[PDB]
């Protein structure tokens, strides 16, 4: 005869969804530099890895349905809002600007409020052409977001430096990592290993090229939701990094004006030296090599046709240009030279791409809630890798692959494609022959 | 905690001593804030507490009270399962078994409760 016996701690799990908190590294950010991301409050400091290798266990993984990516998108939108809630309002600045008709500064003249409510002052500032929209010498102009959003100045002390955030699971839940090479994030996974929580991931966002990301193991691998629809974007993950160095070389100044009781709007200032526009340098030979490898990989999954890379068609300035921030100032570089070769001569000279800086940033896929970024008062220089491209197909032989971007979720899919949270069920019932109590 | 789940029930039963041993943590740091990160930890604490309390609540009602191997005097009805001890403990994993007998967990729990309370009543009679 057999009798029911109860076991606590048996190895059983079911897929689930949870709240995964944040843990950061040892260095607490109480260094007087406070990030938009509040890494200092991510008080759970991370002590040790504790991985276990599930052996003879296969799991099924689908990156497109992960809830881990959806949670991050919301947390990052919220952290940014929290940071800019106590910052200057900037409503007095939506006024007619009288700018000389004689990127480009066009500096303008406007009347603004002084600390005493009754009095007014006339102020002159250098305003980038990209942010000023003509309204119809000395013609009138208006700021770009006057008609659709409220603009709030970034607080000057806060730092936009991106630091790694590790997402971790509460007891009773575990995270599973695939550990499989060339894993196009869909299908069975062989050597699934139980990891305590995710590795360091940088919350960086960029439109056309992914900077400072993780590198694949075996080779360049393509990942997309539906490799038939032309309305879905293709993400490429490189197995070696091309290097891009970007600089704004002029030496500028920050001057502050008082627009109310206790409120300062920092305006751009006259340059000393007048260097040329910012550029970015990208090694031609390595870029063409990785482009050829990507072209061969695309030829593999697309019927062995000839792959033509063409420049972006049009849209918002974010979509048509490479976008990122060097040291707190967002500037959008022109990337036509980087993508024009129909791959299946290659020029080895360092490629320099022109960049036009902007100031008034607008929320991605939203209404209202714009931001203003003050100057930096110094020269800037940031060095980075590029480990991914995002391309979107155009079809109606050869194929047209327009560079794409704009979705803020897709920047982290190359980093969270190999994780899956599973609830643990420890109880279990099995028959044996003990029969007492 | 989950680990070495590919082994059969018999192979992984003798390694349950390792699973129990070595502390069978994070989020214990008090924050007292209402930022974005301050609330997720507050909810994670409650999630863990409720899960552990529910599991120990279920365990206690059957007379196990914190023991890994809980023996019960409940006979095995063939409607829940046909297969013999060898076919159960030699070539079937724990996930496979718990998926096989997922239609008779509520009845098993109820029967265990009946047996525990009836055994509890019998003893009071003996004591008097």
């Amino acid at each position, epitope marked *: 005869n057999l009798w029911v016996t109860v076991y606590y701690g048996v190895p059983v799990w*079911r*897929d689930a969804d949870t709240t995964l908190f944040c843990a950061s590294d040892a260095k607490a950010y109480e260094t007087e530099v406070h990030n938009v991301w509040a890494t200092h409050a991510c008080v759970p400091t991370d002590p040790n890895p504790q991985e276990m290798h599930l052996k003879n266990v296969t799991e*099924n993984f*689908n990156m497109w349905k992960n809830n881990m990516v959806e949670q991050m998108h919301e947390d990052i939108i919220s952290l940014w809002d929290q940071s800019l809630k106590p910052c200057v309002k900037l409503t007095p600045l939506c006024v007619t600007l009288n700018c000389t008709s004689a990127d480009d500064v066009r500096n303008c003249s406007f009347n603004m409020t002084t600390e005493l409510r009754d009095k007014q002052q006339k102020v002159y500032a250098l305003f980038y052409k990209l942010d000023i929209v003509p309204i119809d010498n000395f013609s009138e102009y208006r700021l770009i977001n006057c008609n659709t959003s409220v603009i709030k100045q970034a607080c000057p002390k806060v730092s936009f430096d991106p630091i790694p955030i590790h997402y971790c699971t509460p007891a009773g839940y575990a995270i599973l990592r695939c550990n499989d090479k060339k894993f196009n994030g*869909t*299908g*069975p996974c062989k050597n699934v290993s139980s990891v305590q929580c995710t590795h360091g991931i940088k919350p960086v966002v960029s439109t056309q090229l992914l900077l400072n990301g993780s590198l694949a193991e075996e080779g360049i691998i393509i990942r997309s939701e*539906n*490799l*038939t629809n032309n309305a879905k974007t293709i993400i490429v993950h490189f197995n070696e990094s091309v290097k891009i160095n970007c600089t704004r070389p002029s030496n500028n100044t920050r001057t502050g004006i008082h627009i109310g009781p206790g409120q300062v709007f920092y305006k751009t200032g006259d340059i000393i030296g007048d260097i040329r526009k910012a550029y970015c340098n990208i090694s031609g030979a390595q870029w063409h090599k990785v482009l050829g490898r990507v072209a061969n990989k695309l030829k593999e*999954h*697309f*019927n062995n046709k000839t792959i033509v890379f063409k420049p972006s068609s049009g849209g918002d300035p974010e979509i048509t240009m490479h976008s990122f921030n060097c040291r707190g100032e967002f500037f959008y570089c022109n990337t036509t030279k980087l993508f024009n070769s129909t791959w299946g001569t290659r020029d080895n000279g360092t490629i320099t791409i022109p960049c036009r800086i902007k100031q008034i940033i607008n929320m991605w896929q939203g209404v209202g809630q714009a931001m203003y970024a003050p100057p930096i008062k110094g020269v800037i220089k940031c060095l980075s890798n590029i480990t991914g491209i995002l391309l979107t197909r155009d079809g109606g032989n050869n*194929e047209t692959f327009r560079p794409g971007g704009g979705d803020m979720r897709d920047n982290w899919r190359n980093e969270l494609y190999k994780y899956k949270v599973v609830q643990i069920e420890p109880l279990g019932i099995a028959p044996t022959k003990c029969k007492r109590r | 905690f989950l680990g070495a789940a590919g082994s059969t029930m018999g192979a992984a039963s003798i390694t349950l001593t390792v699973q129990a041993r070595q502390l069978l943590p994070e989020a214990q740091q008090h924050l007292l804030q209402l930022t974005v990160w301050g609330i997720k930890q507050l909810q994670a604490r409650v999630l863990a507490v409720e899960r552990y309390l529910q599991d120990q609540k279920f365990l206690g009602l059957w007379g196990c009270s914190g023991k890994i191997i809980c023996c019960t005097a409940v006979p095995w009805n*063939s*409607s*829940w*399962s*046909n297969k013999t001890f060898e076919e159960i403990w030699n070539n079937m994993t724990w*996930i*496979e078994w718990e*998926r*096989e007998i*997922s*239609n008779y967990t509520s009845q098993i729990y109820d029967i265990l409760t009946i047996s525990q309370t009836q055994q509890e009543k019998n003893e009071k009679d003996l004591l008097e």
Partner: antibody
Amino acid sequence: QIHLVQSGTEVKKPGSSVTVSCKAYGVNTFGLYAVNWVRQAPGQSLEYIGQIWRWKSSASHHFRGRVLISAVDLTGSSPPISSLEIKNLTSDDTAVYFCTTTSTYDRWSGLHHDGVMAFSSWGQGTLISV
Amino acid sequence: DIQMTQSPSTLSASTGDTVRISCRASQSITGNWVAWYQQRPGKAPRLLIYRGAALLGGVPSRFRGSAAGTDFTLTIGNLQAEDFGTFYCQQYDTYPGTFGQGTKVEVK
């Protein structure tokens, strides 16, 4: 949604070979899906043939050494495709053929069990007679 | 290697009546691994019940099933013309997963 299509009716003769291709519109990939082949003789009960599952192909004893299984998943122009072809055809293969699917993403659903499974979706069916 | 039979093979029915169809297995399917299909004349069968008593999506609720040891049954109440057809019982417990003999329902 999910939709299945096969080839048209074909009339063959003994000693020949025939082909049947299955094209699924809605199956993202065959890695987390499975396709089962089933034959219905006229009036007779439905009969199981074989499958490909996790890119592993097999068939029952009655068709081992006489049936062929292959499959290719998403392509830049074509949807996932699965193919069945009879080898050394005999006069007893006169029956309709059907292409089926199922979903294997969750273990705890109940549509599959250790590779033996039900059939969630059914193709329109092609008729082959000799 | 595992066979099943179901009765009645052909049964008359009328609108508004409740019909009970039973399929019997050779062995004891204790895992409730039984599925039901209904096909219209000249149409591929469609899954209605899986795991003994589970409805699919977009299915009328009048279809119901009960599983107990060897006796698996499908109960159809308030029949309609969209519900007349041919029904099947399948087990998927041991390789290969075979089918039932096949039962048909005719009007009146």
